[PDB]
Design a protein around this ligand. Structure first.
Ligand SMILES: CCCCCCCCCCCCCCCCCC(=O)OC[C@H](CO[C@@H]1O[C@H](CO[C@H]2O[C@H](CO)[C@H](O)[C@H](O)[C@H]2O)[C@H](O)[C@H](O)[C@H]1O)OC(=O)CCCCCCCCCCCCCCCCC
Ligand SMILES: CCCCCCCCCCCCCCCCCC(=O)OC[C@H](CO[C@@H]1O[C@H](CO[C@H]2O[C@H](CO)[C@H](O)[C@H](O)[C@H]2O)[C@H](O)[C@H](O)[C@H]1O)OC(=O)CCCCCCCCCCCCCCCCC
Ligand code: CLA
Ligand code: CLA
Ligand code: CLA
Ligand code: CLA
Ligand code: CLA
Ligand code: CLA
Ligand SMILES: CC1=C(/C=C/C(C)=C/C=C/C(C)=C/C=C/C=C(C)/C=C/C=C(C)/C=C/C2=C(C)CCCC2(C)C)C(C)(C)CCC1
Ligand SMILES: CC1=C(/C=C/C(C)=C/C=C/C(C)=C/C=C/C=C(C)/C=C/C=C(C)/C=C/C2=C(C)CCCC2(C)C)C(C)(C)CCC1
Ligand code: OEY
Ligand SMILES: [Cl-]
Ligand SMILES: [Cl-]
Ligand SMILES: [Fe+2]
Lengths: 36, 334, 442, 137, 34, 81, 341
């Protein structure tokens, strides 16, 4: 069970940081018209 | 050309057959987890002690259920609002008996569907669209939050969350009516107006456009081949649509501006459904439908029943029978 | 470019008229606090619990220690009057600045003084305005600390002897406790910051937040945003409004749960019992009634096989039986005397229940926060008679509704702000449709 | 049908003397009963002890008899258990316990009579519904 | 030059005349006592 | 556009309000009287607060016959007289 | 140039409210159904047919007022004012439920008139008559519920009464007595009404957020012209959006708007069929296999068995006051009740 719990903690943290850093990576600039 | 930057470009690519996006990065795993657990529990979960009284309700197909009667059963009332992940159970057998799958499914779904709505914002920005389709979807999304999360919180138990089943849904709406008189609640009445009205205007608008299609075909072929995907001209006559509809009622009750017409189409059911979601969300805090029980009495003080009193006799029949073994004390305060 | 129905969007780059809008609207807020308080006092009857009387503002004042003594007995109504009057009066001053700046003052500010003027895109000026307001907010939170420690105390539902006003001499400063709350699960038996159950921790956290807010206020006056923040955010007035709408929404959802679950900073004496509280009070009531008749409540097996009056929680604590099993995390000053370290102590239940606990349970059970929209108290099948909806139901529902629309407002404005920043908020350019220059999906 | 004097006429004491309320007193009593009593006794039941109700036959069988103005006014002063054996002012609203039951503090002597009057008249109007419970709603 | 009495006139007053009359009856009713 | 006079132009006209400042309260008073005089009760057969049950009656006077129903309610109404 | 033609001319003049030949049926019947409902809900009781108060005069409010169905002892009597029941007496006619049949029958002929109007105007304007066709769904519902359902039952008494709370009671009757939620024709209706509301919202939102920039202002409504030839929003961008978000999207505007007609019209048509079944107590009440198992196996419990207990409570608790003509006397001890409640 603890193996499972650690694994889920890892998987969730990984995806949440992809999300946080993905949007921190110049997201307003990824549009078709005007980029900053 | 850097690794992270190439990843970022694939996540946000407008060239993937299905858009991923940063909201997608959370949606996909969580909807897959909720879907996969749901499918397996619906088919094969053993019975679950929804009401915490050691009286397991059988919800899956292999335990004698059909598509209509089956459900994933809400977790045990003994758990109330406690978090019950798999790793908090001594074993999967315990987790199954107490209704663990329900919690896994609803949390992942609510999360994934929240990200679904964000994903709608995001791709609209990637495509140079206006951004508010996601606002339309917040009305269904709010509704799901109300019956899977808000109503348990206010009542103190996911055991009173809505069941993931066809007949479970009916059990939920019957108990809701007896504990909250939802039919006499104005926000539910606005939902019905939003939903009846939405179906009405769907039919109206589809019938009005269809009536004014410009002849582009012969009687031997679908009229639908009169429109070609991407064509620049419009494919019906809106003035002819307006001239029929304005005369069916009167001129000024008809729309001659398609932008106002289509925004009306959007707002009417969205706002009705916000209200009916608000209704569930506020009856979660027990601010219930209008109560006119014995509001008409005569000169002596006899009660003169109205239809509200008859409704009450039905509510009473629901109240006294629901969860027939769970109450030891005379008032069902939650 | 805005129609009449979006006409307040015409103020976006008119800093003077927009200042008047904000200050006049701030007067409306202070007006209602004042008027509503005076309406409640006019209608207040002291012999009646507040929660039988439709009061939402008097309970907030009593909770700060004014006008009440032991048990929430209202001792002195004048503080209530004072609070109303000063608010009502102060709104005229804000009304006055409001209509002045909105109608007569300079439309735009930045030409008059370069201090009060602003451009939304001036990232430095904007963090400075932010900082001033952070310091103000920090000051406000310390005002609460000052009242608790130096100017009379706060009402403490937990005070030994039925509740009373008490000065807080040892605010919790330990950050393991203060910030420990911020990391508790929001789920049941934990309840995140909603579970704060003593005024030491309430006062202590307001010390932290005051200092944090002042600190950050000075930070933002002194700095400009870093590049990673420059590139992640939209810098525009609508965008800033959308950020605040999201924060207001989140806060409104928290307050909903606060007023529905917490009986410390919403004492039940004033607001009525919580849902869980009332449900536990019914099990207490019949446990008392049945034991007096001779029932052995510890050994009484109910229909299901579970205890009729007492059972175990999933972790073993002895708890009230029946449907209220779901509410065993409830803690209230009328109940805790019966609790040992295994939960409810059978020997205290047999021997030590006091009449004031029998009374409090009967009262809270008959004042459960259930009621119709037209204020008929009780379950929905109850007949007319009792004119009652709990202040907690009124406060929870109102703010859930408000919190929800503010979230919608956040999505509305945040999306618009994005599209306005990229330049397609008004629609697609027919000569430059992005999708028509993209490859086909299939 | 209407609120006639015959219905407004209720036993004063156990001797058998009667008293005729006015419509005023009756509506006075109803109001006061909602103010001080209905939270537990809506409809003639007792939410916190459903075994004891306010039907006239129940009151008649209480010790001392409570099916009359005197017995009821006394009950509001010095409530006892159904068999008369213990005084329960500590846990039942009463004039004797108005320090702890503050709603009873402004009840005057004729308020008590109106309240006791309401309780005795209402069964005559409502029949089984009074003290009958949800079965009769 | 506009007509005064039309089909329109008639449909209007078909509805509006009894509305007001009905509103007045329903107004009196709020003062009925048992 | 159809040749009737525009509504906007009618309800700002002095002549209009000269008639309807009389016709509108007369109808409002008219309907008031229909109730205040008791005529509405008698026209429609609606019971008054005092005529739902006879004094000691708690029986609904429910119609129970098709072609004798007129005679039934007539009997129930005298059981009050 | 005969009179018939002259009348045609006058009926079909362009005026603020078009009249038509169909106006001759529509306008009197619509005005009378509507006036009957406002007359009954303001002044008329239900005391003699139902044991209920049902007008403002009596103290009811907008939610509880109703024009109630006739007494069960009337059977399916037309209850004509001049018929053998009321015998020309307006008052008794009111007291016996005559306004229920007045409204229902005049409503029926009004609905016919309204659909004839849709046909009449569509012919004069030169458009296809799909709005009339669509309107067949409301008609089907009205006849099935207000006419066929009670004609299969013992009397008009068991039709819906024309009121807000009375209809709420009609909903709950159907749950407890017919188990109508279990009925697949109701389910197809639910999917058509909810599916339709979805379509209405998703289509309106899509157009409003794929708009072309055809004006300089921030209010985008100004930039449409009803006679412009150009589509006012991008089907192309709309299609790519939904294809990428949902996986499929519409590509054919014509099919899209036909589907919008099709979904809610069919749903309503399906539910009508199921209510025709219920005219005969031809219910989808039970699943036989579940009952046989649950009779034998007292540990077997589903949401299906849970909901029948609820239906059973409903029937026994509402029946005596809801069917006063049956003189049901259920003593306390026979009422179904769970523990404590
Ligand atoms: C920004 C980005 C945000 C992303 C972060 C996402 C991670 C967080 C997810 C939150 C999950 C919320 C579930 C709440 C469940 C529940 O138990 O929640 C309630 C808890 C409070 O918990 C209760 O807290 C109680 C504290 O009271 C205790 O202490 C008290 C002290 O007086 C009393 O003594 C009381 O008797 C005693 O029990 C107890 O612990 C209870 O057991 C426990 O249930 O609320 C709280 O944590 C307070 C906050 C709850 C917020 C929930 C609002 C949800 C809003 C959804 C809106 C959806 C709209 C959709 C738009 C379309
Ligand atoms: C066309 C005209 C234009 C109308 C447009 C419609 C706008 C909505 C307003 C509806 C119109 C009716 C309002 C006036 C009638 C009414 O309400 O009148 C009601 C009262 C005045 O009535 C008094 O209402 C009281 C209600 O009881 C309250 O008072 C009692 C006194 O003992 C008890 O304390 C009880 O617990 C407490 O709840 C009593 O019933 C009094 O007897 C009665 O006189 O007005 C109120 O309170 C006034 C409060 C108004 C502010 C509303 C704040 C509520 C926010 C909650 C949001 C919840 C959202 C969920 C929605 C579902
Ligand atoms: C801090 C709060 C806040 C602020 C400052 C703004 C500010 C703005 N909004 Mg946003 N908005 C908010 C919250 C806020 N909004 C919320 C919570 C929502 C979700 C409901 C929205 C949804 C929204 C939309 C959809 C739009 C705006 C728009 C705008 C702009 C023009 C608004 C205008 O002129 O309204 C004018 C005000 C009215 C027409 C009156 C509305 C009255 C409401 C609907 C009735 C409420 C009545 C009450 C409940 C009961 C009545 C009782 C009875 C007795 C009367 C302006 C920049 C517009 C925009 O994008 O422009 C940039 C726009 O289109 N807003
Ligand atoms: C926003 C928070 C809030 C909350 C929780 C309350 C709660 C309460 N008020 Mg206060 N009140 C408020 C705002 C609020 N009010 C405001 C803005 C005003 C000025 C109009 C007042 C003026 C006021 C008066 C004058 C009175 C109250 C009273 C009451 C009580 C009964 C409410 C009732 O029956 O409503 C009935 C419910 C409605 C009318 C529902 C409104 C539905 C809206 C239109 C939908 C919302 C759409 C979106 C926003 C309750 C304690 C009464 C009381 O008991 O006083 C002691 C009373 O007499 N309040
Ligand atoms: C809190 C509510 C609020 C506030 C504070 C504002 C504030 C403002 N609006 Mg918005 N607005 C609102 C609600 C609000 N609005 C709503 C609900 C709508 C939808 C109907 C609009 C629609 C709208 C439009 C369409 C426009 C504005 C504009 C403006 C600004 C200029 C108004 C002007 O010159 O009028 C002049 C008005 C008068 C001279 C009439 C008298 C008004 C006074 C202030 C009444 C106050 C009386 C009070 C009792 C006095 C107390 C005095 C005492 C304190 C000393 C101003 C800042 C305008 C703008 O942006 O201009 C660039 C504009 O074009 N508003
Ligand atoms: C946050 C609100 C706010 C803001 C930013 C402004 C900003 C401004 N005002 Mg406005 N004003 C406000 C509120 C506000 N005012 C209110 C509430 C009123 C009515 C009382 C006015 C009445 C007013 C007038 C009559 C005039 C201005 C003018 C001006 C400008 C010059 C200010 C100056 O140099 O004064 C000098 C600064 C001081 C004398 C310092 C004042 C210190 C105050 C009194 C104490 C502050 C403490 C605290 C914040 C108050 C809370 C106490 C309470 C909670 C108990 C400036 C842009 C002038 C202008 O624009 O002319 C074209 C002008 O003529 N204002
Ligand atoms: C009104 C409050 C407020 C607002 C609007 C801002 C706004 C801003 N701050 Mg300041 N700040 C404030 C208060 C505030 N600040 C205070 C009081 C302090 C003192 C502690 C600071 C200290 C501070 C520093 C030290 C810095 C900023 C910076 C910034 C900028 C970037 C913000 C950012 O990216 O956050 C977005 C936040 C993240 C991307 C990471 C946050 C992750 C959290 C933990 C998520 C938790 C959410 C969860 C659902 C709720 C539960 C909470 C949990 C802890 C239990 C921005 C202008 C930056 C800047 O450019 O300064 C020049 C910067 O470096 N702020
Ligand atoms: C024009 C539209 C219209 C339609 C379709 C109906 C239809 C109906 N009405 Mg309604 N009615 C209308 C207008 C309409 N009414 C108007 C304008 C009024 C106001 C006066 C009323 C007032 C009214 C009342 C008060 C009642 C009805 C009733 C009815 C029902 C029975 C009618 C009946 O039995 O006919 C029978 C008669 C005919 C079908 C006439 C046929 C004509 C033939 C072809 C010619 C005969 C000529 C003659 C015999 C020869 C001369 C004789 C000699 C002496 C020279 C039916 C649903 C009843 C109802 O709803 O019951 C619940 C009812 O009680 N109607
Ligand atoms: C007073 C008090 C207290 C204390 C308190 C405290 C101390 C608190 C704190 C609080 C805090 C500490 C808070 C925080 C918050 C945060 C947040 C809320 C965040 C947010 C974030 C965001 C929003 C972000 C986003 C993003 C991303 C993710 C990516 C990129 C983009 C962006 C940036 C947008 C206590 C309890 C003891 C008691 C009572 C009283
Ligand atoms: C039956 C009959 C008949 C007929 C009748 C009629 C035809 C009548 C009519 C009637 C009518 C014609 C009536 C009317 C009424 C009205 C009403 C009563 C109204 C009211 C309304 C209101 C109250 C409104 C208000 C409001 C609200 C509430 C909210 C929103 C807004 C508004 C403003 C809308 C005859 C003679 C043949 C004979 C036989 C029998
Ligand atoms: O309505 Mn009735 O109340 Ca809300 O709990 Mn008490 O009984 Mn049981 O658990 Mn599901 O259900
Ligand atoms: Cl159930
Ligand atoms: Cl229980
Ligand atoms: Fe369309």
């Amino acid at each position: 069970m603890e193996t499972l719990k650690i694994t889920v903690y890892i998987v969730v943290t990984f995806f949440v940081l992809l999300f946080v850093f993905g949007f921190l990576s110049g997201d307003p600039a990824r549009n078709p018209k005007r980029k900053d | 050309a850097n690794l992270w930057e190439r990843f970022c470009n694939w996540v946000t690519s407008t060239d993937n057959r299905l858009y991923v996006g940063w909201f997608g990065v959370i949606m996909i795993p969580t909807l897959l987890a909720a879907t996969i657990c749901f499918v397996i529990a619906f088919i094969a979960a053993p019975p679950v002690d929804i009401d915490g009284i050691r009286e397991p309700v059988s919800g899956s197909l292999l335990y004698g259920n059909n598509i209509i009667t089956g459900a994933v059963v809400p977790s045990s009332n003994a758990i109330g609002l406690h978090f019950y992940p798999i790793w908090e159970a001594a074993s999967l057998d315990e987790w199954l008996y107490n209704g663990g799958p329900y919690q896994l499914i609803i949390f992942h779904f609510l999360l994934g569907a929240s990200c679904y709505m964000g994903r709608q914002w995001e791709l609209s920005y990637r495509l140079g669209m206006r951004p508010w389709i996601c606002v339309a979807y917040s009305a269904p999304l709010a509704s799901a939050f109300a019956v899977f999360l808000i109503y348990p919180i206010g009542q103190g138990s996911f055991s009173d969350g809505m069941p993931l089943g066809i007949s479970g849904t009916f059990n939920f709406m019957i108990v809701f009516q007896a504990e909250h008189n939802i039919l006499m609640h104005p926000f539910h009445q606005l939902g019905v107006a939003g939903v009846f009205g939405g179906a009405l205007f769907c039919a109206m608008h589809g019938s009005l456009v269809t009536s004014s299609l410009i002849r582009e075909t012969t009687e031997t072929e679908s009229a639908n081949y009169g429109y070609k995907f991407g064509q620049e001209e419009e494919t019906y006559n809106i003035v002819a649509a307006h001239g029929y509809f304005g005369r069916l009622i009167f001129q000024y009750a008809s729309f001659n501006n398609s932008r106002s017409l289509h925004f009306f189409l959007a707002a009417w059911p969205v706002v009705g459904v916000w209200f009916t979601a608000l209704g569930i969300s506020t009856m979660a805090f027990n601010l219930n439908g209008f109560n006119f029980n014995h509001s008409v009495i005569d000169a002596k003080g006899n009660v003169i029943n109205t239809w509200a009193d008859i409704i009450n006799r039905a509510n009473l029949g629901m109240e006294v029978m629901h969860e027939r073994n769970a109450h030891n004390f005379p008032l069902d305060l939650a | 470019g805005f129609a009449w129905w979006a006409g307040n969007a015409r103020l976006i780059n008119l800093s003077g008229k927009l200042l008047g809008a904000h200050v006049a609207h701030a007067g409306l807020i202070v007006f209602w606090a004042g008027a509503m308080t005076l309406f409640e006092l006019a209608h207040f009857i002291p012999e009646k619990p507040m929660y039988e009387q439709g009061l939402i503002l008097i309970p907030h004042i009593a909770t700060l220690g004014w006008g009440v003594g032991p048990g929430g007995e209202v001792v002195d109504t004048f503080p209530f009057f004072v609070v109303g009057v000063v608010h009502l009066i102060s709104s005229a001053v804000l009304g006055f600045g409001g209509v002045y700046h909105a109608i007569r003052g300079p439309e735009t500010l930045e030409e008059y003084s370069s201090f009060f003027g602003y451009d939304w895109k001036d990232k430095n000026k904007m963090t400075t305005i932010l900082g001033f307001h952070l310091i103000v907010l920090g000051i406000g939170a310390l005002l609460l600390v000052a009242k608790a420690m130096f100017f009379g105390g706060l009402y403490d539902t937990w005070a030994p002897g039925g509740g009373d006003v008490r000065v807080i001499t040892n605010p919790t400063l330990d950050p393991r406790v203060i910030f420990g709350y911020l990391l508790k699960s929001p789920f049941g038996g934990e309840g995140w910051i909603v579970s704060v159950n003593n005024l030491e921790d309430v006062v202590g956290g307001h010390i932290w937040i005051g200092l944090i807010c002042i600190a950050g206020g000075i930070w933002h006056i002194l700095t400009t945003p870093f590049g990673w923040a420059r590139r992640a955010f939209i810098w525009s007035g609508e965008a800033y409004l959308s950020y605040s709408l999201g924060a207001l929404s989140m806060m409104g959802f928290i307050a909903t749960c606060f007023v529905w679950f917490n009986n410390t900073v919403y004492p039940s004496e004033f607001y009525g019992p919580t849902g869980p509280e009332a449900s536990q009070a019914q099990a207490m009531t019949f446990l008392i009634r049945d034991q007096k008749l001779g029932a052995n409540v510890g050994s009484a097996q109910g229909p299901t096989g579970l205890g009729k009056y007492l059972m175990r929680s999933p972790t073993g604590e002895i708890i009230f039986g029946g449907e209220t099993m779901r509410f065993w995390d409830f803690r209230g000053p009328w109940l805790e005397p019966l609790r040992g370290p295994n939960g409810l102590d059978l020997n205290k239940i047999k021997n030590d229940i006091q009449p004031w606990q029998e009374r409090r349970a009967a009262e809270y059970m008959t004042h459960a926060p259930l009621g119709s929209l037209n204020s008929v108290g009780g379950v929905a099948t109850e007949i007319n008679s009792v004119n009652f909806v709990s202040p907690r139901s009124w406060l929870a529902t109102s703010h859930f509704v408000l919190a929800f629309f503010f979230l919608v407002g956040h999505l509305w404005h945040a999306g618009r702000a994005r599209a306005a920043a990229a330049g397609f908020e008004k629609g697609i350019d027919r000569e430059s449709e992005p999708v028509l220059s993209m490859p086909s999906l299939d | 049908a209407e609120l006639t004097p015959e219905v407004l006429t209720v036993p004063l004491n156990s001797e058998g003397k009667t008293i005729t309320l006015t419509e005023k007193q009756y509506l006075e009593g109803k109001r006061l009963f909602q103010y001080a009593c209905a939270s537990c006794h809506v409809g003639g039941i007792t939410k916190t002890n459903p075994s004891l109700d306010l039907r006239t036959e129940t009151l008649a069988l209480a010790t001392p008899p409570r099916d009359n103005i005197e017995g009821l006014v006394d009950y509001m002063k010095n409530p006892t258990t159904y068999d008369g054996e213990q005084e329960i002012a500590e846990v039942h609203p009463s004039l004797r316990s108005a320090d702890i039951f503050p709603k009873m503090r402004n009840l005057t002597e004729k308020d008590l009579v109106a309240i006791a009057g309401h309780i005795l008249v209402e069964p005559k109007i409502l029949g089984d519904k009074w003290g009958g419970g949800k079965v009769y709603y | 030059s506009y007509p005064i009495f039309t089909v329109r006139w008639v449909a209007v007053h078909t509805l509006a005349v009894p509305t007001i009359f009905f509103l007045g009856a329903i107004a009196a009713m709020q003062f009925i006592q048992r | 556009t159809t040749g009737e006079r525009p509504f906007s132009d009618i309800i700002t006209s002095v002549r209009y309000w000269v008639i309807h400042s009389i016709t509108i309260p007369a109808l409002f008073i008219a309907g008031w009287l229909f109730v205040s005089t008791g005529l509405a009760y008698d026209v429609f057969g609606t019971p008054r607060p005092d005529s739902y049950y006879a004094q000691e009656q708690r029986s609904i006077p429910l119609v129970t016959d098709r072609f004798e129903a007129k005679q039934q309610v007539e009997t129930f109404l005298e059981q009050l007289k | 140039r005969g009179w018939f033609d002259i009348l045609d001319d006058w009926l079909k003049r362009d005026r603020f409210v078009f009249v038509g030949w169909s106006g001759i049926l529509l306008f009197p019947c619509a005005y009378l159904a509507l006036g009957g409902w406002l007359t009954g809900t303001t002044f008329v009781t239900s005391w003699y047919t139902h044991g209920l108060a049902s007008s403002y005069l009596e103290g009811c409010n907008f939610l509880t007022v109703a024009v109630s169905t006739p007494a069960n002892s009337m059977g399916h009597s037309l209850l004509l004012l001049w018929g053998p029941e009321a015998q020309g007496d307006f008052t008794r006619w009111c007291q016996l439920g005559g306004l229920w049949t007045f409204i229902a029958l005049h409503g029926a002929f009004g609905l016919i008139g309204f659909m004839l109007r849709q046909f009449e105007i569509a012919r004069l304007v030169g458009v296809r008559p799909y709005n009339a066709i669509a309107f067949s769904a409301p008609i089907a519902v009205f006849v099935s519920v207000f006419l066929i359902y009670p004609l299969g039952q013992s009397s008009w008494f068991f039709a819906p009464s024309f009121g807000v709370a009375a209809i709420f009671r009609f909903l709950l009757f159907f749950q407890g007595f017919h188990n109508w939620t279990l009925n697949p024709f109701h389910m197809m209706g639910v999917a058509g009404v909810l599916g339709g509301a979805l379509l209405c919202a998703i289509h309106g939102a899509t157009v409003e957020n794929t708009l072309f920039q055809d004006g300089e202002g921030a209010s985008t409504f100004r930039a449409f012209n009803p006679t412009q030839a150009e589509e006012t929003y991008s089907m192309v961008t709309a299609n790519r959006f939904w294809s990428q978000i949902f996986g499929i999207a519409f590509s054919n505007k014509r099919w899209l708007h036909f589907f919008m007609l099709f979904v809610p019209v069919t749903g309503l048509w399906m539910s009508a069929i199921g209510v025709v079944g219920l005219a005969l107590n031809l219910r989808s009440y039970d699943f036989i296999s579940q009952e046989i198992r649950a009779a034998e196996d007292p540990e077997f419990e589903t949401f299906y068995t849970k909901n029948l207990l609820l239906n059973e409570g409903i029937r026994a608790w509402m029946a005596p006051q809801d069917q006063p003509h049956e003189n049901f006397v259920f003593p306390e001890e026979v009422l179904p009740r769970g523990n404590a409640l």
